[PDB]
Design a binder for this molecule. Structure first.
Ligand SMILES: Nc1ncnc2c1ncn2[C@@H]1O[C@H](COP(=O)(O)OP(=O)(O)O)[C@@H](O)[C@H]1O
Ligand SMILES: Nc1ncnc2c1ncn2[C@@H]1O[C@H](COP(=O)(O)OP(=O)(O)O)[C@@H](O)[C@H]1O
Ligand SMILES: [Cl-]
Ligand SMILES: [Cl-]
Ligand SMILES: [Cl-]
Ligand SMILES: [Cl-]
Ligand SMILES: [Cl-]
Ligand SMILES: [Cl-]
Ligand SMILES: [Mg+2]
Ligand SMILES: [Mg+2]
Ligand SMILES: [Zn+2]
Ligand SMILES: [Zn+2]
Lengths: 591, 591
């Protein structure tokens, strides 16, 4: 950490304008005299005064700005303590700040200007050296003198020689002198689009960037970075023809920092915020939701409640004392073929605000996780995001998880538990966030597993994976004349076109907004009561087989129930509900 | 959306002819004075007045045309309200719209003209920049000046710098000045023939196309597109003779849009249409059709009825509430060695208007589905279409399905259920329509399975696949003296050269025409009576096994039957007949 508060104040009080006037001393004065609450700062001014500050404003905008406003405020109360009786705070507005362009939208209108790109590094060359001023010796018996070539002019990226010795005037052989030539650190790197911004199966576009001097080695392959610089056009075969008058685009980096991915939340309407605030009050809230989850289905009151809790999720707090505590809850539905599994998933996607519906079988290399791929056209490797990476921060409804890739099975455990996926290929080592909630459907290898034989050996999924699902609903279909009829009826109605009173009790769009608010602003805290009940339940159920991992889920489900409750506090009623669901699942395994 | 209605009217009221006259104001006036019902518009005129409209007419002809006609009509009733007592509608005719050429038929007579090709994108280069107008500096101590090069002339594709400085007149070294040079976005892409238009196992031809400025990135690899532009010739190695004076052909794009595949229907002569209604009123129509399916075989009344319903298909309806509903019905014939399966398929192929008879094993990489293949001569990948993709919108009579590729088993579930096949290879990700009805034959792993052993395990196809066939006819051949005798006769007869007595009971040609009509115009609506019968049956058959999948099939078969009725309303008779067959197939399992 460094103090940008003094450079900022120093910049305001000493920067010089077109007429050697203190541009900002005067602007701060008017602001005072007219009781204004914003100071308009030009980016180029700061950039020219102190590059470090300029870039801190670009790379750490959200943290640095509030500090600068505070420093400006204190500075103002110093000029006039009275300002405070009229204004509580000041706003600094930086105009002229480099546009943020998505890598794949770079056009000719951007060449020559200062912009900023977001991406991931996939290649770095070793540090080399560039000549920005040479010294040649005119090997000639009458001459043999030396001189700095590009006179009053930096050498070109292409290397140019002196046709006519400027010391002797006569041509000849020029033998570059290294000892007296000046050098600058150079490094070529390649950055690709952020995996999340690329359509499944598609190759992520790439861009060449040049780091020089102090920027050399600011990052390593596999790093997510924010690069700011000027784009220009180049050619591998310079100043000559070749195939045309077509040029490649590359950036001359000015600043580069490793960054963190920023999920973009959904717009909250204070109108909606209260609307939701209203439903929360409602008493049959918990049940409407479950009943709104997937109407085009008869019953499954419990199964629907599972999905419901999954959508809201648990605490999800990662802290020092005990590192990461995952709040996302995963739900798996194993069942007899034709029991609506593959169906129910698809239905939730239609409710999906931030989801991805996909199956255990993929046609893309990434699949359900991620992977490094080779790009024939560029010859370099790149990272492609599978479903869990694309679904980060959201939901990933996985169907036929039974038929999942070999590559997927390997890294699958990491994504569900660690909530990340690490990739190592070529010189690339990157860790992508897979903070996503999972709801998958699975079938037993041969078909109905209803046979007294255990349910889990019948499914093509290692018991290691199973232990990772907070709730697993073993499903079987036994005909109960009435129920079959019920299902039939339901199906016949759905098949017959429109006119179907199969609408969610609660409103979908309004529910989406419901959940989001629910995951962003509400963070349930464990209750004393819950703690007691669950604890007793745990010993009880174990006295019955169970694992501490189940306990892990228990707490998560409780938190979830409470999040729909938005208390935000857990309550015995909560826990109870949580354990209730959990037991129903266990008696289910008994088939 | 944009409204082309005002631009259109604007074009009519303001366009200017060769003699500054309002060309169209006068054409509209004569149309009025002479009570004409068609306005002739020249494509070139529209194109020169407003490119967006010109291309909307080219890319969205079917939708845009009626709108323009409507707008012209109103413009007309405005000039003369009376025009309406003599004419109801006006037609706009666009003379001069670019011709639509099949990629493989491009010839020298097309170079230089505006045409339109239909294809699928397979490669896209990253966005580059092209100099259309440069700025050059004369590196020379006496000159050192600047100047835009191609004077009054755009820089050519190839880079050409002045031999003699136009400022000083004296030759020397020239240094490009990027900052003062003007750039235009550039992109090279490769388009291939529509998979459907390419013979099995054959490589689809390709074409280089150049996108510039705002056409850059109008699509991605894997996309079906409609490109409009001018073809020209190029040499990868400019101005120098390579191997000969032969040139490649590429297109300079003017317009490119992602398109949808357009199946072309059969032409119903209103005579055939009336004939059709007469046939429909007929008494033994259902049985007529079955007897006409394949007389060259005796019996198999139910099998012939199955095939029959498969051709007419179910409702097939894609809508939001329950997204995609599949109407195509799939039939599978499992049997003993020598029970006539292979023969029957091929016989139904003879009646095939929109079908592809083909075996389970293929010698082509595509096979039954599709696949990305590599082309050695061009070095790029391409998409090839298998039987289900070529048969889209039609039928695919598969024989010996038992013997199918590894790649096939993988993606076939998609084809039968989703009626699509997705492919991901290199930077290509495409989804090809596979809306095709399947009728296959299959043999048991080794032989006769009469054994008490369950039929399906003996045929090499995962139960997952079988569950996708609405009707499966397990066949077995027992002697029963007389019947064998019947077959002998048939075969012996079939050996006579001309016209063995039995043949289509109903006119084949007329039948094809029949089905097509049925499928296009008929859309049977489920019926109350049907609803209850089927429901009561669902519960009944489940009382002794059965699945909801059986339900969605039952409903489709009903619709099909009613479709041959052409009501279009299902009836109690429907379901009844539908379930009748369904039962027969089930009793058949017991072997
Ligand atoms: N309770 C139910 N509510 C609505 N539809 C049901 C229900 N039970 C079964 N179905 C039917 O089951 C069908 C889906 O079966 P499916 O989920 O594809 O089996 P699987 O999961 O093994 O692939 C749907 O078309 C639906 O009509
Ligand atoms: N009902 C039938 N009508 C006409 N021909 C039949 C009939 N049943 C059997 N055949 C004879 O069976 C032969 C075809 O046997 P085939 O279908 O090739 O056995 P598979 O299906 O195992 O390959 C034909 O040449 C045909 O003469
Ligand atoms: Cl921006
Ligand atoms: Cl800008
Ligand atoms: Cl990330
Ligand atoms: Cl045409
Ligand atoms: Cl022409
Ligand atoms: Cl298609
Ligand atoms: Mg399924
Ligand atoms: Mg055969
Ligand atoms: Zn010299
Ligand atoms: Zn000159």
């Amino acid at each position: 950490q460094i103090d940008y508060r003094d450079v900022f104040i120093e910049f305001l009080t000493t920067f010089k304008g077109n007429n050697n006037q203190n541009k900002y001393i005067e602007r701060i004065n008017e602001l005072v005299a007219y009781r204004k609450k914003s100071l308009i700062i030009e980016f180029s001014d700061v950039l020219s005064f102190n590059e470090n500050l300029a870039y801190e404003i670009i790379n750490n905008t959200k943290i640095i700005l509030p500090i600068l406003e505070g420093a400006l405020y204190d500075h103002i109360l110093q000029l006039d303590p009275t300002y405070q009786r009229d204004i509580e705070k000041v706003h600094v507005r930086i105009v002229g700040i480099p546009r943020v362009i998505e890598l794949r939208k770079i056009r000719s209108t951007d060449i020559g200007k200062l912009i900023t790109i977001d991406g991931i590094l996939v290649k770095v060359t070793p540090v080399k050296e560039r000549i920005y001023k040479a010294t040649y010796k005119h090997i000639h018996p009458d001459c043999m003198q030396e001189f700095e070539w590009p006179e009053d002019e930096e050498m070109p990226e292409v290397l140019e020689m002196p046709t006519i010795c400027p010391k002797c005037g006569k041509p000849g052989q020029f033998r570059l002198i290294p000892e007296k030539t000046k050098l600058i650190d150079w490094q070529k790197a390649v950055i690709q689009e952020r995996p999340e911004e690329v359509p499944s199966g598609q190759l992520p576009r790439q861009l060449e960037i040049i780091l020089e001097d102090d920027l050399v080695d600011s990052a390593r392959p596999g790093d997510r970075v924010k690069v700011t610089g000027i784009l220009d056009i180049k050619q591998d075969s310079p100043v000559k023809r070749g195939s045309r008058a077509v040029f490649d685009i590359y950036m001359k980096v000015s600043s580069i920092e490793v960054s963190q991915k920023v999920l973009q939340e959904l717009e909250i309407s204070p109108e909606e915020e209260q609307i939701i605030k209203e439903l929360a009050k409602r008493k049959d809230i918990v049940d409407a939701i479950v009943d709104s989850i997937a109407p085009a289905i008869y019953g499954y009151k419990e199964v629907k409640k599972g999905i419901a809790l999954a959508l809201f999720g648990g605490v999800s707090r990662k802290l020092p004392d005990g590192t990461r505590l995952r709040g996302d809850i995963h739900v798996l539905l194993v069942g007899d073929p034709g029991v609506a599994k593959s169906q129910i998933l698809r239905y939730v996607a239609n409710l999906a605000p931030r989801a991805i519906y996909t199956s255990g079988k993929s046609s893309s290399a990434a699949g359900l996780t991620a992977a490094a791929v080779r790009d024939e056209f560029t010859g370099g490797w790149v990272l492609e995001a599978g479903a869990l990476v694309l679904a980060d921060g959201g939901y990933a409804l996985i169907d036929e998880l039974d038929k999942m890739s070999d590559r997927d099975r390997s890294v699958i455990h990491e994504a569900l538990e660690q909530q990340t996926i690490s990739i190592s290929k070529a010189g690339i080592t990157a860790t992508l966030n897979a903070r996503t909630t999972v709801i998958a459907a699975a079938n037993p290898k041969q078909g109905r597993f209803n046979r007294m034989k255990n349910p889990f050996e019948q499914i093509d999924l290692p018991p290691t994976l199973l232990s990772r699902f907070d709730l697993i609903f073993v499903l079987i279909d036994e005909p109960d004349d009435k129920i079959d009829s019920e299902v039939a009826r339901h199906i016949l109605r759905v098949r017959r076109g429109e006119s179907e009173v199969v609408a969610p009790k609660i409103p979908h769009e309004i529910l989406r907004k419901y959940i989001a608010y629910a995951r962003k602003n509400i963070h349930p805290v464990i209750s004393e009561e819950a703690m007691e009940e669950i604890e007793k339940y745990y010993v009880r159920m174990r006295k019955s087989p169970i694992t501490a991992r189940q306990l892990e889920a228990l707490i998560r489900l409780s938190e979830a129930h409470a999040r729909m409750r938005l208390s935000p506090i857990v309550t015995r009623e909560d826990a109870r509900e949580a354990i209730k669901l959990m037991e129903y699942t266990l008696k289910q395994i008994a088939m």
